[PDB]
């Protein structure tokens, strides 16, 4: 499969995803931006089975934008997470949900940074850090090891680099590049792709 990771620090959220979009023993594209911009301060990492990920993410993105334009203010990250959970839970019935594993990462001017984990059953849970895909198993221990509630941005990015390097060392799949963005008081910030 693929890989997502999120780290929440004092007043920011660091997230990273692979760029590989495979279809079979072959990979079809290596610049896959797996990261959907819900609003000016919310990012929605979506992974899962082909087709459903993009459709569900597009639906939620259009709804967050629609709410923003209908009201003037913007959905708070907790509001976006809960609304996405409500939307994904209700589809665990007819349109065989969508097996979309989500990782919503956002910042609020009022509540501080927030990172929400979501399995394909729509089981929402706030967490200081999380990960999806088979790669999560290899990196979660390293995240547990060197993570403290108080982490400067540079320490967080080098921790992410540590996780990705070890994932390169062990994980059987070939994930050569990872798109990284940070979310803080000033919008969303792209960071230099971690490449090998």
């Amino acid at each position: 499969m693929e890989y997502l990771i999120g780290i929440q620090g004092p007043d920011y959220v660091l997230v990273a995803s692979d760029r590989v979009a495979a279809s079979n023993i072959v990979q079809m594209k290596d610049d896959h931006d797996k990261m959907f911009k819900m609003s000016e301060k919310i990012l929605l990492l979506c992974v899962g089975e082909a087709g459903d990920t993009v459709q569900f993410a597009e639906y939620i993105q259009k709804n967050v934008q629609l709410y923003k334009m209908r009201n003037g203010y913007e959905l708070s990250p907790t509001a976006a997470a809960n609304f996405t959970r409500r939307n994904l839970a209700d589809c665990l019935r007819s349109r065989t949900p969508y097996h979309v594993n989500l990782l919503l990462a956002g910042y609020d001017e009022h509540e501080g940074p927030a990172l929400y984990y979501m399995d394909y059953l729509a089981a929402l849970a706030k967490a200081p850090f999380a990960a999806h895909g088979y790669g999560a198993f290899l990196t979660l221990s390293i995240l547990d090891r060197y993570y403290t509630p108080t982490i400067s941005r540079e320490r967080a990015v080098e921790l992410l680099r540590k996780c990705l390097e070890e994932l390169q060392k062990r994980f059987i799949l070939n994930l050569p590049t990872f798109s990284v963005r940070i979310i803080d008081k000033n919008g969303i910030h792209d960071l230099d792709n971690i490449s090998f």
Binding site: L92, R93, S94, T96, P97, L121
Partner: protein
């Protein structure tokens, strides 16, 4: 904000939707998982007789989740109407909701009519409901009561079929209960005799079955009296505790404590 998506939820009544989640969440089955709760089987030895001028119903009071005794005093003689009662075996929730809805229907009927409802009416309502639901509502009921036309005793099976008998028994301990009746039953018993017979019949289903066993309930319905004897007999008592476990204060360690004064 009344979001534009589903036209509306204009019709409640038994979802499905949300069933394919059930179908493909093998979890419990294959993919380890298996927390995935299952339902119940409450109603395990229920019996009824028709003595000289009324009905005597009986039932144990054990409710088993799986193979663990969940409740030890689960009442299984439900109220249908001031002269009609109904024991309940099979799946627990189905029997509960079915009997409650039939009680509501029946006493609306008796309210608009202005006279005491007949048992046969409740028998028909239950029969037609269960047949309508093709038996997926597993609810085995023993219907009993006394109208102007004398005592009546019905046994409703989950699939819709009903049997009118002078004595019926249902539940996991039905067979063990039926043994007592087939050997000791006579027509035209007096009140005390019928109560003793039913007590033995339920007692057979208590000691001689695993799915059953607790206090014994009785419901003596006559032409004019209704005794809801509960609990009629306490054959089994908790074995007296020998140790004095008696958890002391300060024995547990507490990380964080929050206190909120309410009033």
């Amino acid at each position: 904000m009344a979001a534009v998506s589903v036209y509306a939820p204009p019709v409640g009544g038994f979802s499905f939707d949300n069933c394919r989640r059930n179908a493909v969440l093998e979890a419990d089955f294959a993919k380890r998982g298996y927390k995935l709760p299952k339902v119940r089987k409450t109603g395990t030895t229920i019996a009824g007789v028709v003595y000289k001028d009324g009905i005597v119903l009986g039932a144990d009071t054990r409710a088993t989740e799986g193979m663990v005794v969940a409740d030890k005093n689960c009442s299984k003689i439900h109220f249908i109407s001031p002269n009609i009662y109904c024991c309940g075996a099979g799946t627990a929730a189905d029997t509960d909701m079915t009997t409650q809805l039939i009680s509501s229907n029946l006493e609306l009927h008796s309210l608009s009519t202005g006279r005491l409802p007949r048992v046969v009416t409740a028998n028909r309502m239950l029969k037609q409901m269960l047949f309508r639901y093709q038996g997926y509502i597993g609810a085995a009921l023993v219907l009993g009561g006394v109208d102007v036309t004398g005592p009546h005793l019905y046994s409703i099976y989950p699939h819709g079929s009903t049997d009118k008998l002078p004595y019926v028994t249902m539940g996991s301990g039905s067979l063990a209960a039926m043994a007592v009746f087939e050997d000791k039953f006579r027509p035209d018993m007096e009140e005390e005799e019928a109560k003793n017979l039913v007590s033995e019949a339920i007692a057979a289903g208590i000691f001689n079955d695993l799915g059953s066993g607790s206090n014994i309930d009785l419901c003596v319905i006559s032409k004019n009296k209704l005794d809801f004897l509960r609990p009629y007999t306490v054959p089994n008592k908790k074995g007296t505790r020998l140790g004095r476990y008696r958890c002391e204060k300060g024995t547990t360690a507490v990380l964080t404590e929050k206190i909120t004064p309410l009033e």
